[PDB]
Design a protein around this ligand. Structure first.
Ligand SMILES: [Mn+2]
Length: 155
C-alpha cells in the first residue's frame, strides 16, 4: 500500500549568489540514502529546491513521502504560488516568467509521482536529520564540483 519514506533536505549557500550545496537524506524502514552536491555559483533558494528534487527523483515507485524542509521559500512556493503557476502557463501576475521556473517545474514533476506530506521545520536545531543535511550541504558548498546550469542572473 505504498511504502512510506521520510525525506529530509537542506540547501546552503555561502553567498547570494555564491558557492552552494544541497544535502538530503532518504529514510525507509530504518535504512537511509544520502545525497549531496556542490555548485560553484548558485543561491540558497535553488539548492533547497534541488535537495528535494534529487531525493524525490531517486524513488523508483510511487510512495507516501513525508518531506521535511526548513526553506521558507519552498514553503511559500508550495503553499501559495505553485497552484497558480501551473494554472497560468508558469507566469506571474502580468504574464511574466517565474523565478526559478526550471527547478520548480522539475520539483512539481517529482511531487506528482508521490503522495506528499510536507513538514515545515524551523531550521535544524533539534532535527538530527536536517542538521545532517545542513552539514552535507555546507561540505558540498566548500568543495563545489558542478555549475548550476539553470542559474543566470535576475537577483
Ligand atoms: Mn538550513
Amino acid at each position: 500500500m505504498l511504502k512510506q519514506v521520510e525525506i529530509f533536505t537542506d540547501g546552503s549557500c555561502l553567498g547570494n549568489p555564491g558557492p552552494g550545496g544541497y544535502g538530503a537524506i532518504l529514510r525507509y524502514r530504518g535504512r537511509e540514502k544520502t545525497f549531496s552536491a556542490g555548485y560553484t555559483r548558485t543561491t540558497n533558494n535553488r539548492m533547497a529546491l534541488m535537495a528535494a528534487i534529487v531525493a524525490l527523483e531517486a524513488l523508483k515507485e510511487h510512495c507516501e513521502v513525508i518531506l521535511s524542509t526548513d526553506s521558507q521559500y519552498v514553503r511559500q512556493g508550495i503553499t501559495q504560488w505553485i497552484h497558480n503557476w501551473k494554472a497560468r502557463g508558469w507566469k506571474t501576475a502580468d504574464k511574466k516568467p517565474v523565478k526559478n521556473v526550471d527547478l520548480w517545474q522539475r520539483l512539481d514533476a517529482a511531487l506528482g509521482q508521490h503522495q506528499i506530506k510536507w513538514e515545515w521545520v524551523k531550521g535544524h536545531a533539534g532535527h538530527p536529520e536536517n542538521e545532517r543535511c545542513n552539514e552535507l550541504a555546507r561540505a558540498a558548498a566548500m568543495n563545489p564540483t558542478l555549475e548550476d546550469t539553470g542559474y543566470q542572473v535576475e537577483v
